[PDB]
Amino acid sequence: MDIKYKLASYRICSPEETFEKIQEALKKIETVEIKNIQHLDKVNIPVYYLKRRVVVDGKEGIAIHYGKGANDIQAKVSACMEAIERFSASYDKNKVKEKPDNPINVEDLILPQYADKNVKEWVEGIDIINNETIDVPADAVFYPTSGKLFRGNTNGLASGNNLDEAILHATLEIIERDAWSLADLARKIPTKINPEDAKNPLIHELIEKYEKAGVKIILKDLTSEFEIPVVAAISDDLSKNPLMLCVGVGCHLHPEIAILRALTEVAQSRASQLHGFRRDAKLREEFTSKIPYERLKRIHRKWFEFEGEINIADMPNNARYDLKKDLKFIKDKLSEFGFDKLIYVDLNKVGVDAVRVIIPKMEVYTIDRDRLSRRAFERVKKLY
């Protein structure tokens, strides 16, 4: 059991140690400030930002990264490790191969109708299901990208305390967004989670923080075929502020970690909205604030309504508090359901483990509406 921190983090070392270890990396990425923004909201849940210096072709600018957690250090490390993950993802010509030795079938990535299928830039990865090297498009690895094959996105990027930690996290994120994609397609999301039987004290603390703030939380089960918990936490503010209709989605082998991640992400979504620094937050502030509250509740009906309730005790728990064993389990479940490749690319750039994970055939529709496979509809039918 290499997972030493089980209660909130599911990591090999403490957040305090992570923060100590990444100090050099944080200067290398040109960090300008790291701040807590809890005060913007009424829920008293830790949310951090990190701002870093960026040059977008000509002008100097700022990139922002948000962090979430049950306590202060977790939220701060979350922001820092997102910033490092995202910095590590930028295009690196030293990794580019022009002639692919063993190219993936690019169709399996689920391509938009406008995809330029003439890939000129390839990157080598390791398929850890089949234990072989494989070449994947650069557009599927780096961020940002030229956007030739598809629009660049951050799905399956992760940093961590070691290689396996980053791989596990990025894999869980792929699983998360695939499941979220299926939920977005589904006409109904029938199953509510009652968190009363949580063994983890931090779930109760978080739920109670929302109640006192007059924020109604509903938990929805999005768990897909793999029996890897995916949970949506949806906030409904008694203030009827349309901008406070927010979702957080958590994914983990342990259902209580998934719930913790969903609950803290809700606070993160709310706080980044209220911060209004990001382009999407600013635009949501401008346009969605004019959308009547009752229209939004009506549009997103399926998220709030429910046909049945389960307990956490009803949810699968295949966590073993050991990275290699957890990865083994996931590999088996992916293979079992025809997801026969689990590919990672090493993106370590500033002395911190960072990867891209690619699991061909996993859906990204929730991020990019232009990408949706024929097989998603049957999957939705089966689960929902």
Binding site: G152, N153, T154, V247
Partner: peptide
């Protein structure tokens, strides 16, 4: 349009 969310960037 959408519910508020956080966790990814997508280029336009």
């Amino acid at each position: 349009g959408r519910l508020g969310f956080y966790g990814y960037d997508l280029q336009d």
